[PDB]
């Protein structure tokens, strides 16, 4: 038997409900110096979503995936830009600008 | 006919209660007397039915009966009468003919009793919207609405429209501010056919200036419905609000509401513009409210002038130059092979493969 | 429920469906003898195209009587009611 | 009608006549990506047309995103080349358009209630799922997406003639 | 041809199509009556 | 009078007040209709008294 932890809720009236037929997945914001070490991550790596999923702990694979697209619908010339350009393969480094953003986003937070 | 003559103006009359057919032209009868059953046999005899004489009604399994049973006490639920009861297990025994219908899982066979019942109150005029049904079923409306698609795909039964007067009929009855119970102040109390005709006219106006079409209509109706009861007294009602009218009527108000409530008082404003005594009253979206009897009274000139100088969504109406851009005609294909480059630049080098395969090993 | 049944000879209604209006259904106010129909109804003998059997309301009555007035009404099931008064 | 839609996306199967590793060009390859665990075949994406792509180990191939049916077959010979180049014996053989989408504008509003009362034999108009009207003519199976708005999507062709004449026929019906 | 009636308590000369739902306009009325008829009716005073 | 013309029952609905867990959480309705009482002429619910 359950000593007072559960509390009392009211819920449904039992008559007519809003037909909401929507699921908003929360997807996290893109920040400007995020987006620029997000296409960064892609100029290094490529087209690989897995390892940009793994190297990218803030954010979710689904995530990268509709970023990716929508940079290619919108800004295909950037997308092919950073193609076009190369940078050696970068784990240790692109941790340490992970963290070098998070210290940024939390100084921003501050302010 | 007559055998004798061969008439054929053989007529039925009513003799002193006897049935018999008489030849009109040679008052001949030819056929006379009638056998009917009598009610202390009708009350014996049992009625047999073409399915259970054929054999079915056995080749039910434990799914479709679980489905019937299911429709059964949804529209029980519901209150409806006998008829929509038949009409949806009708409906339902109709699709199941189907191989892929009835190799469904669990919430295929939901979803179907729903959109079944759904179209079964939909003929006979019922307005019902999806929620309402949902709302009953253990399946979320995702799901629903995709397996209604793909139902009404594969069946093409008739779907008429939503009506809007009967959605209102029916929405507005389901507010509490009709009745001075002890929750509800008695100032905010109205009368419900007052309320009722106010929103009716409201969403007339909408529906004439393209408001119900692609927009849910549940929130136009809400925000119609509480636009109603503020003009019917704006000294104490005038400083709610959308959401303090929805917690005191005990309504989840739609989400998008506001934009639609936004874009009626809009309306009204440009309507007010054109009546000369408003239009000097330089009226603001908050203190139109009260004027809108004026202008559900001669909403018909003042729509009319209003479109004279449409109504469509406010991201396309930010003044597009560009109407489709027309994108450049490069249909080419080279000769055979444009570059060769290109693969050079899409494979992956040994060094990038030992990479990769360190880094997820 | 169809209209009087018009006899082309006389481009009136035959005397069976004399007291019927033009809706199919008696009118108040007129007599009405043995054997005269009351209501024009028809109903579907399917339950693919419309087939219609004529099972008219007629007046089964001794002497002749009168309509004082008639009500229709309609159920949430759609199924009209249609009542007559007869009167002697 | 004085409008000619604006063909978007071509639909077109080819089949290459021989087996394929998905593993070996999926490992060789930077624009490839396989997961089997979800999805087992192959997703190549090639920039110049801006399209995408399909690969099956049983040597079944498809492309979109293309505009024109040249446009596919140069994505789909692109394709073929680079499979050779992964050491394998693709041939383009029994190329077909199977689908095309297109896209226009009427430039005016369109009353999907007066359509569906009209033409409910032809549509299924279901505002409360989704906003745009759904027309099935079935002449020559198309299926059009119409909007409030007036713009109407086209599906189902097989030659950008069959897209024109859908729309030349539907353009006077909504007109009405 | 219009088809007229009555409704049950204003008496609202009201004339409806077939398959219309019972309305009275002015009201909400749903129980409606028949009009009388037009033709001559003859009675005896026996 | 109306209920005699139309052939209907003269009644009135029974709401009640329920609660109940779900999912392991309580749950109240306030007015849930459970049926409709014939309600006898000029009792104390029927509108003619
Ligand atoms: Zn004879
Ligand atoms: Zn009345």
């Known amino acids: 038997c359950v000593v007072e932890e559960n509390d009392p809720i009211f819920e449904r009236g039992s008559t007519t409900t809003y037909s909401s037929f929507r699921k908003n997945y929360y997807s996290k914001p893109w920040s400007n110096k995020e987006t620029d070490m997000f296409f960064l991550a892609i100029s290094m790596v490529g087209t690989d979503f897995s390892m940009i999923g793994q190297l990218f702990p803030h954010r979710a694979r689904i995530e990268i995936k509709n970023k990716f697209k929508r940079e290619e619908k919108t800004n295909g010339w950037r997308i092919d830009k950073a193609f076009q350009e190369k940078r050696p393969f970068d784990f240790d480094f692109f941790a340490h600008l992970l963290q070098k953003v998070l210290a940024e986003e939390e100084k921003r937070k501050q302010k | ?361 | 429920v169809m209209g009087p049944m018009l006899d082309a000879a006389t481009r009136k209604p035959i005397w069976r469906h004399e007291i019927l209006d033009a809706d199919g259904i008696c009118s108040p106010g007129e007599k009405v003898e043995n054997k005269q129909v009351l209501v024009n109804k028809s109903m579907p003998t399917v339950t693919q195209q419309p087939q219609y059997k004529d099972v008219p309301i007629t007046y089964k009555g001794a002497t002749d009587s009168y309509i004082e007035k008639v009500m229709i009404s309609s159920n949430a099931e759609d199924a009209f009611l249609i009542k007559m008064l007869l009167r002697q | 009608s004085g409008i000619v839609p604006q063909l978007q996306n071509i639909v077109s199967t080819v089949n290459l006549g021989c087996k394929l590793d998905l593993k070996t060009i999926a490992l060789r390859a930077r624009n490839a990506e396989y997961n089997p665990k979800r999805f087992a075949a192959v997703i190549m994406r090639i920039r110049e047309p801006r399209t995408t792509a399909l690969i099956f180990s049983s040597g079944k191939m498809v492309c979109t995103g293309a505009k024109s049916e040249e446009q596919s077959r140069l994505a789909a010979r692109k394709y073929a080349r680079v499979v050779q180049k992964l050491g394998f014996p693709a041939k383009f053989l029994d190329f077909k358009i199977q689908n095309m989408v297109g896209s226009c504008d009427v430039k005016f509003p369109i009353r999907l209630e007066g359509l569906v009362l009209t033409h409910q034999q032809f549509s299924s108009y279901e505002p409360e799922l989704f906003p745009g009207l759904i027309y099935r003519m079935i002449k020559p199976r198309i299926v059009l997406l119409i909007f409030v708005s007036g713009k109407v999507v086209l599906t189902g062709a097989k030659v950008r003639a069959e897209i024109y004449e859908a729309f030349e026929n539907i353009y006077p019906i909504l007109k009405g | 041809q219009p088809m007229i009636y009555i409704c049950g308590e204003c008496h609202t000369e009201n004339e409806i199509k077939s398959r219309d739902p019972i309305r009275c306009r002015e009201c909400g009325y749903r129980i409606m009556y028949k009009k009388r008829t037009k033709r001559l009716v003859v009675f005896d005073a026996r | 009078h109306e209920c005699r013309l139309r052939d209907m029952t003269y009644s009135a609905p029974i709401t009640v007040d329920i609660e109940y867990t779900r999912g392991s959480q309580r749950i109240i309705r306030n007015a849930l209709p459970i049926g409709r009482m014939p309600i006898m002429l000029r009792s104390s619910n029927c509108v003619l008294t």
């Open chain 2, 1 to 361: 006919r007559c055998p004798d003559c061969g008439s054929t103006e053989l007529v039925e009359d009513s003799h002193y209660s006897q049935s018999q057919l008489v030849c009109s032209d040679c008052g001949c009868v030819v056929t006379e007397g009638v056998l009917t059953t009598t009610f202390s046999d009708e009350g014996n005899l049992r009625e047999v039915t073409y399915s259970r004489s054929t054999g079915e009604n056995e080749q039910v399994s434990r799914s479709q009966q679980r489905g019937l049973r299911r429709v059964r006490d949804l529209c029980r639920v519901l209150q409806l009468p006998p008829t929509f009861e038949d009409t949806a297990v009708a409906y339902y025994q109709q699709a199941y003919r189907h191989s892929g219908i009835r190799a469904a899982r669990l919430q295929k066979k939901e979803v179907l009793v729903g959109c079944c019942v759904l179209i079964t109150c939909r003929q006979h005029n019922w307005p019902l919207t999806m929620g309402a049904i949902c709302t009953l079923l253990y399946a979320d409306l995702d799901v629903f609405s995709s397996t209604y698609m793909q139902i009404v795909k594969l069946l093409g039964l008739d779907v008429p429209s939503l009506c809007l007067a009967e959605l209102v009929k029916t929405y507005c009855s389901s507010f509490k501010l009709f009745q001075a119970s002890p929750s509800v102040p008695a100032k905010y109390v109205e009368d419900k056919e007052k309320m009722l005709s106010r929103t009716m006219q409201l969403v007339e106006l909408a529906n004439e200036t393209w408001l119900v079409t692609g927009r849910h209509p549940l929130p136009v109706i809400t925000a119609a419905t509480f636009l109603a009861w503020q003009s019917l007294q704006p000294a104490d009602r005038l400083s709610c609000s959308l959401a303090r009218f929805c917690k005191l009527a005990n309504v989840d108000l739609p989400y998008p509401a506001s934009s639609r409530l936004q874009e009626l008082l809009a309306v009204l404003l440009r309507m007010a513009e054109q009546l000369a005594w408003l239009r000097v009253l330089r009226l603001d979206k908050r203190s139109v409210v009260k004027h809108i009897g004026d202008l559900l009274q001669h909403r018909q000139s003042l729509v009319r002038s209003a479109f004279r100088d449409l109504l469509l969504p406010p991201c396309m109406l930010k003044s597009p130059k560009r109407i489709c851009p027309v994108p450049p005609v490069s249909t080419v294909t080279g000769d055979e092979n444009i570059s060769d480059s290109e693969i050079e630049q899409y494979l992956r080098t040994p060094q990038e493969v030992r990479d990769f395969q360190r880094a997820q090993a």
